[model samples]
Target: DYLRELLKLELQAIKQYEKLRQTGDELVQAFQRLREIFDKGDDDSLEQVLEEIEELIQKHRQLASELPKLELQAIKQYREALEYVKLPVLAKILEDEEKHIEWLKEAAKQGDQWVQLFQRFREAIDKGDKDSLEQLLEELEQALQKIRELTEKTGRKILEDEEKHIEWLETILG
Candidate 1:
């Protein structure tokens, strides 16, 4: 039951992420593990899960802030699955999920740092901290340029990986 539900949730995420961005190197690995473990058709459960995700996504714009919470649920489900099934694949899925949670936590902290910086810049503008304002402006722009570079490089790698990623992707589900 957990594996079944996990497959549906992952397939839901693939579609949802399709609406946003890359399939991600890690996402593909988890997806295959779940698929092979389940090894069945995408029956009504999946359609239902996809519909639910669409509803949730519609309500939440980016839907990213919800991911760590969502991943935690998946982790719990996998942990329970491991307790019951004791499958190696389940263990691997759990490991990937744990890493996903950690990455998201870091990602959240990174986002918060910039959000705080942006707000601090606004505060500086208001207080007219002439010295600190220039410092903040420089720091903020450096952050901006660095992230843009990182995103661009990240995209390049993903797209490069996608050559093979989509090769099988189309064969698997398209």
Candidate 2:
């Protein structure tokens, strides 16, 4: 099953490499890396291996030069093209990642940020005069409550959105 899935992904990558070959020669080396990997212990000669690595280094340099071009428009086009190419696999990956993202968000919301912030304010109140502390405690309680409420509410909204996005991916994949 793993090999079959790997081949599916490999074939998809090969098609992409071919498409990218037209834009520039920098990717030629990176694409060659696949051939070398698959041909391992079979027919890959020393010259072929060296050539692949050399091209990969060149491709890396090209990508470094191209990094500045990765603006919003480029990102949009890249994502659109990428979605067109690996819609099935990407959808599955996104669904899986959404679970982790939601988990992390929930964990963050339940973390020490609120307690830490409240502790700081509490210390400030304790050191102040009675009247000052009394005045501050009321506002501090309100702020702490607001923060906790915002965190949970934001967390729920994020999880809900992620769930919908995952569902959308599954539906699109089908």
Candidate 3:
């Protein structure tokens, strides 16, 4: 059951990463293979799935570790671009990139907590408990609001992806 929950979180993450298209194609392939292995009911091997999940976690962790350098590069680029008053458009794009870096940092910091929330969401869906599902959605709404507040406080743009995710959740609930 826990494995199933983790698989759900991983799948959600895979979608997010795919949308960003920042990471290479191999990450998507790896995630898809894991999903395929898990979906085979009778053929599923819990041990094998567990091993793959562990590897997946490690790969993501590696990506998270690499973010700080990327963030720094974005910061440096933003500063250099800011010097060119003639290219305000380029400077604005760099500014947005810097904001995105900040957002990614916050996301990585809260990643595990988000995974737990997704696990709870999976549990509600699996049980077909409508009450629990509504409560989970309420909680997610609060979480999204908080993220928006923080993003605003940091002078960053609201996350459009999260807005889309919330809309999807609302549609499902409806």
Candidate 4:
């Protein structure tokens, strides 16, 4: 049932995103835009989206951001659904779920970065060393700046996107 539920989620997002697909968002990654167009398809579309995503990245290279936690939570649920569901698209090519590759990469990126931060925090606190503390603080100073940058960008985007049509997300969530 949740497999069916997951398809609904993908198709739903596809519909909405398709309307906005023509827009080239600066904060959002290039592959991200092309990515939406390629999900749940075969090698023809996969290679197409891949080449196009790579091309766009070349034209206007930028940073990364991801879909909302709503989709993420949905991913966790539906991926499990794949385990039992024998998804035609997915079972045929677990790579089909590479639809979430970009998300996983960012999650991996953040995890890698967070592990470094944790190491810095633990070392600074355990040794009670000012040099390490300053090093830690220095890295953290930039880290917070980075975090706040994404925070503000996503914060505004979420509010603005939601502000456009308030309760649809809620209704769907419910």
Candidate 5:
């Protein structure tokens, strides 16, 4: 029960800090809307809205200072709770973490490969290796052109997929 009580406090802190961040984001949106109105040449309305926006900006600054402290404390408490937890859950979390790490590593390696491939392509062109340069250039051009066409044809589909990604992340996190 002691552990649960302390864990509850940490969870509450996490929620409070997250809510503060969300509040700041909404305030920023409000400020931006006011700024847009002012930029459109309504001086009197702009003056009033600017004052409101200033208040929100100050509130955001105060919360920003507090948020990191709360978040750090919460995370520290979470680690402590993790240490006190039983082995099975800890193992599961470690497994999931390893999978995430592997995914990131694979993506990074793929990026490095592409960088090296493109650098070689450019180097061959510079060294007057005409045959190799032409072949690489044609391959790269075709690949890029195909990607361009796919983007043109499926841009909306990509956006839709992004929306699904957001929902998926929410589901997983929740």
Candidate 6:
């Protein structure tokens, strides 16, 4: 579940980074650090892990909220460009921008789903109930596999963070 949350956050971050004209070095470095932490499994305790998870939750919320504003800005920019751009090639660009807005909206929705899932998982973890843990583990596995299949079918790097999440879950479940 934690892995799922991270993957969702990473997906949003990737989208944001891709759409921006100039992605900041700090943004790239922050994502690198996130991956490193996942790879190392370095949270010393559940509290520390939860701290990271909550931080990511906050970020996901921020991304979900901000994407629409960015989309609006893009819409404005494209509308303004259409006035100056006499070529059909620029129309293609506007078309792509419209598609990107749709994509970002979908991404935001995915992020919300993951956040809710993570919250449920957190509640189960807090309860320290074995059955709840096992149930969530199974659900997490199924969710990750579903996304993995989607990635495979799309021939694109969708859910690029799934492998790491699955690995993390394996370590936890083992």
Report lDDT (CA) for all predictions. 0.51, 0.42, 0.48, 0.44, 0.47, 0.49
Per-candidate RMSD, Å: 17.0, 22.8, 16.2, 18.9, 16.1, 15.4
What TM-score would candidate 5 get against the native?
0.39
Model 1 C-alpha lDDT per residue in residues 28-100, reported as the tens digit of each score: 2333343343245344443443344334334433555556566677678778877776866667656766765
Among residues 3 or more apart in sequence or in different chains, the pairs in candidate 6 whose N, CA or C atoms overlap within 3 Å are none
**lDDT, residue 109, candidate 6:** 55
- Per residue, candidate 3 scores C-alpha lDDT tens digits across 56-139 of 545665765554554455446446545654344444444555566667677666656654664575455456675644466457
Worst 10 residues of 2 by lDDT: 66-75
Candidates in descending TM-score order: 1, 6, 3, 5, 4, 2
Could you tell me the lDDT of residue 115 within candidate 5? 39
* Candidate 4 TM-score, true structure as reference: 0.34
Model 1 steric clash pairs: none
Clashing pairs in 4: none
**lDDT for model 1, on a 0 to 1 scale?**
0.51
Give the top-scoring candidate (TM-score). 1
Runs of candidate 4 exceeding 4 Å displacement? 1-69, 72-112, 128-131, 167-174
- lDDT score, residue 103, model 6? 57
Write the residue-wise lDDT of candidate 2 on 69-172 in tens digits.
32222234334545557656454444433453454345445434544543454355347544554354455445545644644464344345434544554455
Query: Any runs in candidate 1 off by more than 4 Å, and if so which?
Result: 15-62, 132-134, 145-174
Q: Alpha-carbon error at 49 in model 3, in Å?
A: 1.2
lDDT of 3 at 68: 50
Error of 3 at 162 (Å): 17
Candidate 6 structure quality by residue, lDDT tens digits, 18-72: 4431322233334445445545645455545555656755654565466566545
Clashing pairs in 5: none
